[PDB]
Amino acid sequence: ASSPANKVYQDRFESMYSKIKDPANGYFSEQGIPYHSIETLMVEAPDYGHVTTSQAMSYYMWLEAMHGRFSGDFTGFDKSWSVTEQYLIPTEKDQPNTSMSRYDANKPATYAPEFQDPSKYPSPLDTSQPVGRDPINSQLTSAYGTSMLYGMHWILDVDNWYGFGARADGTSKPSYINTFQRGEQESTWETIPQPCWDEHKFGGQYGFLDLFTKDTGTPAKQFKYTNAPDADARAVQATYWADQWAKEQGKSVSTSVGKATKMGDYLRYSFFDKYFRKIGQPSQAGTGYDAAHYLLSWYYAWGGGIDSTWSWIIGSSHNHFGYQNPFAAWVLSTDANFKPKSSNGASDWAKSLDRQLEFYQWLQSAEGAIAGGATNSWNGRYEAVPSGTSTFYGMGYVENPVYADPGSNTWFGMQVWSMQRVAELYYKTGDARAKKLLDKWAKWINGEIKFNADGTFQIPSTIDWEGQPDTWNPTQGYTGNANLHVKVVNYGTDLGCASSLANTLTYYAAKSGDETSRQNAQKLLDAMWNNYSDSKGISTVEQRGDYHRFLDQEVFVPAGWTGKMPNGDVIKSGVKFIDIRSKYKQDPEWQTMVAALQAGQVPTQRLHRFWAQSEFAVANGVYAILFPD
Numbered sequence: 347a348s349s350p351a352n353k354v355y356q357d358r359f360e361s362m363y364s365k366i367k368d369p370a371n372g373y374f375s376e377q378g379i380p381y382h383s384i385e386t387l388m389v390e391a392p393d394y395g396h397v398t399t400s401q402a403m404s405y406y407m408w409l410e411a412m413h414g415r416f417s418g419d420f421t422g423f424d425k426s427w428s429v430t431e432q433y434l435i436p437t438e439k440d441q442p443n444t445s446m447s448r449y450d451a452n453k454p455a456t457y458a459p460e461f462q463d464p465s466k467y468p469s470p471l472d473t474s475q476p477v478g479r480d481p482i483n484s485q486l487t488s489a490y491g492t493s494m495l496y497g498m499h500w501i502l503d504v505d506n507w508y509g510f511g512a513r514a515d516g517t518s519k520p521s522y523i524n525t526f527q528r529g530e531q532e533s534t535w536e537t538i539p540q541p542c543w544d545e546h547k548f549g550g551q552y553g554f555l556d557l558f559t560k561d562t563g564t565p566a567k568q569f570k571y572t573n574a575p576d577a578d579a580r581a582v583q584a585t586y587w588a589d590q591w592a593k594e595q596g597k598s599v600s601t602s603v604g605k606a607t608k609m610g611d612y613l614r615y616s617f618f619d620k621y622f623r624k625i626g627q628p629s630q631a632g633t634g635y636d637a638a639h640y641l642l643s644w645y646y647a648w649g650g651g652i653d654s655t656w657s658w659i660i661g662s663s664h665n666h667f668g669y670q671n672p673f674a675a676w677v678l679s680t681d682a683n684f685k686p687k688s689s690n691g692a693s694d695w696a697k698s699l700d701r702q703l704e705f706y707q708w709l710q711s712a713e714g715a716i717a718g719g720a721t722n723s724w725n726g727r728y729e730a731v732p733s734g735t736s737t738f739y740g741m742g743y744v745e746n747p748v749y750a751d752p753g754s755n756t757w758f759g760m761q762v763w764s765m766q767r768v769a770e771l772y773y774k775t776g777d778a779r780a781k782k783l784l785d786k787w788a789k790w791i792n793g794e795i796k797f798n799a800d801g802t803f804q805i806p807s808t809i810d811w812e813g814q815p816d817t818w819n820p821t822q823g824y825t826g827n828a829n830l831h832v833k834v835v836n837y838g839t840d841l842g843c844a845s846s847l848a849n850t851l852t853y854y855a856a857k858s859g860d861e862t863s864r865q866n867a868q869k870l871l872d873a874m875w876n877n878y879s880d881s882k883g884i885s886t887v888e889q890r891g892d893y894h895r896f897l898d899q900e901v902f903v904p905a906g907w908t909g910k911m912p913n914g915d916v917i918k919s920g921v922k923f924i925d926i927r928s929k930y931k932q933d934p935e936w937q938t939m940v941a942a943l944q945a946g947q948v949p950t951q952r953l954h955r956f957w958a959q960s961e962f963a964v965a966n967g968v969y970a971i972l973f974p975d
């Protein structure tokens with residue numbers, strides 16, 4: 347039987363769970379897929395509210411697992427896995443084994459450079475540049491009996507709003523799509539949405555392919571998908587708890603544990619340099635594991651031909667601390683129930699766990715906040731690392747990994763999402779490395795939480811950085827990074843971030859006994875419950891400072907290139923964001939948004955983001971379990 351839980355917070359979790367699953371609230375599509383947000387006029391990472399993300403699915407798993415903990419019913423958790431596999435993990439039809447089985451482990455992909463401005467794309471493929479060897483593919487095909495990959499594609503157009511349909515039929519739903527393709531300066535406002543399955547039916551003469559990559563001959567019809575590593579790791583994290591909670595009640599989620607273990611096996615592709623170049627010696631092709639940084643990178647992607655048989659896979663050279671998950675690594679490398687079937691799965695994850703904790707410590711600022719990350723591909727072209735730049739195993743420090751518009755590490759959210767995983771690990775194992783990181787990080791954040799007399803509160807929203815960490819010497823360890831500083835630019839009341847923060851502090855307090863952390867966590871949860879509840883969960887009014895880009899952001903299109911979006915929108919040089927998404931004008935909030943822009947005001951919205959609502963729910967459950975009295 348499961349231990350007793352605090353009745354007050356369990357009830358709050360149960361209430362949120364009901365609001366999230368309530369058909370009248372509209373968090374899910376008719377197929378049972380959760381939307382990024384109830385509201386459709388939404389641009390921030392995805393560019394439409396009713397697309398879904400692997401991030402949303404992993405939060406859906408966490409929510410249902412927690413529900414299973416309190417109700418004893420785990421059919422919902424098993425259902426979240428069923429929906430994931432059916433809709434976000436490309437099936438046999440979406441990534442034909444005929445093409446995947448032609449993959450060549452000695453030549454994973456063809457090199458192409460990355461540019462710091464979208465106008466430099468398409469990027470030219472260069473077969474003469476070296477590419478290392480893929481050491482894990484043989485392990486995976488042997489263990490699973492297929493060349494297809496088992497990982498979640500990161501974004502899905504749930505109701506076929508864009509019109510690409512399924513495998514180019516233009517009418518089926520959901521629809522696999524992708525957006526980001528052109529480097530660090532290509533914000534969510536500067537992309538050209540494209541289908542994952544490109545048969546040249548939409549877009550230009552060769553679909554959307556030659557907008558991004560330039561080859562010698564005619565572009566072939568092809569498919570391609572991109573994984574968001576932190577989402578798949580969260581899925582493993584959530585499944586571990588579901589397993590633990592199910593067993594305390596004599597229940598079983600065996601089938602789901604198997605899916606999560608397999609996903610974690612394939613997730614190892616994020617451990618590798620984009621083109622398998624040796625870590626620390628980017629000019630040389632790797633000979634296998636010497637190309638593994640063992641961190642959860644920004645992504646791993648794969649694709650192949652549709653009418654001809656060939657395929658490729660790439661890792662990523664860019665690493666952000668916000669994506670790490672020491673807990674998932676601990677699970678996959680130590681729990682017998684989650685041991686991957688591949689020969690080196692568990693051991694590789696053991697190496698990743700140690701490497702990840704070194705990464706966090708190397709990046710810990712003088713104050714306590716965690717700095718950006720590192721890359722094995724300076725400027726995305728394996729250029730020489732500037733002299734004076736600090737390094738981590740030969741990789742150069744980057745303040746804002748992968749994206750600069752806006753900086754990927756200027757949002758406070760990354761801090762709590764990532765440190766929450768460190769807190770779970772510390773809670774379960776009492777690991778000294780984790781304790782050291784949290785003692786300093788928790789003292790920093792506890793001094794930045796502001797409670798107002800009227801019950802509202804504020805926490806860091808936007809942050810900035812100065813300096814860099816000292817070069818990492820594994821035998822020396824943390825130097826204190828006296829020249830690395832974080833600065834809080836402004837504060838806000840992001841309910842998702844505040845919930846994740848409460849979660850982190852609760853796990854930490856439960857293990858360390860730190861009263862300050864426990865009372866701040868409870869005050870946060872109470873303040874949100876008492877002052878921000880509405881009929882759909884919780885919400886607050888927030889400013890959408892970037893919405894002016896709906897109308898004034900020009901989207902780059904190569905000279906002479908012309909094409910059409912499924913709905914007829916013309917794609918050509920000169921178009922603005924709204925020009926290739928004209929359906930947005932039929933959105934209920936459109937007129938309101940435009941009226942505000944015309945009056946020179948900043949638009950505001952009251953948003954219900956799926957991950958935020960779940961984050962709040964889960965945080966209540968976690969508190970209920972760790973502080974039953």
Ligand SMILES: OC[C@H]1O[C@@H](O[C@H]2[C@H](O)[C@@H](O)[C@H](O[C@H]3[C@H](O)[C@@H](O)[C@H](O[C@H]4[C@H](O)[C@@H](O)[C@H](O[C@H]5[C@H](O)[C@@H](O)[C@H](O)O[C@@H]5CO)O[C@@H]4CO)O[C@@H]3CO)O[C@@H]2CO)[C@H](O)[C@@H](O)[C@@H]1O
Pocket residue numbers: 391454455456457458460500524525526527528529558559561566568570571572573574575644645646647649657658660
């Ligand atoms: O086709 C002929 C030829 O292909 C060769 O293979 C090429 C392939 O053609 C290219 O399309 C492919 O290009 C990849 C880029 O190198 C890479 O930079 C880009 O990365 C994007 C990713 O597409 C996108 O999904 C991802 O989005 C993330 C968001 O940024 C995050 O905010 C969110 O949280 O998570 C999502 C998901 O991670 O962003 C990244 C980074 O910008 O992906 C391109 C593919 O989509 O390169 C291949 C190799 O060069 C092949 O080798 C030849 O054999 C073949 O003939």
Ligand SMILES: OC[C@H]1O[C@@H](O[C@H]2[C@H](O)[C@@H](O)[C@H](O[C@H]3[C@H](O)[C@@H](O)[C@H](O[C@H]4[C@H](O)[C@@H](O)[C@H](O)O[C@@H]4CO)O[C@@H]3CO)O[C@@H]2CO)[C@H](O)[C@@H](O)[C@@H]1O
Pocket residue numbers: 390391392399400401500574576577757759807808838840842843888889890891955
């Ligand atoms: O979605 C897949 C992808 O998601 C990544 O995580 C995203 C979240 O999905 C997204 O909701 C989140 O959006 C933030 C946004 O970045 C902030 O800028 C914004 O905060 C604003 C606020 O809106 C303003 O009112 C205020 O004035 O300024 C602040 C600061 O600009 O808050 C929203 C909601 O939290 O962004 C996340 C980071 O990109 C994952 O990282 C990735 O792994 C997933 O694949």
Ligand SMILES: [Ca+2]
Pocket residue numbers: 531532533536751
């Ligand atoms: Ca830009």
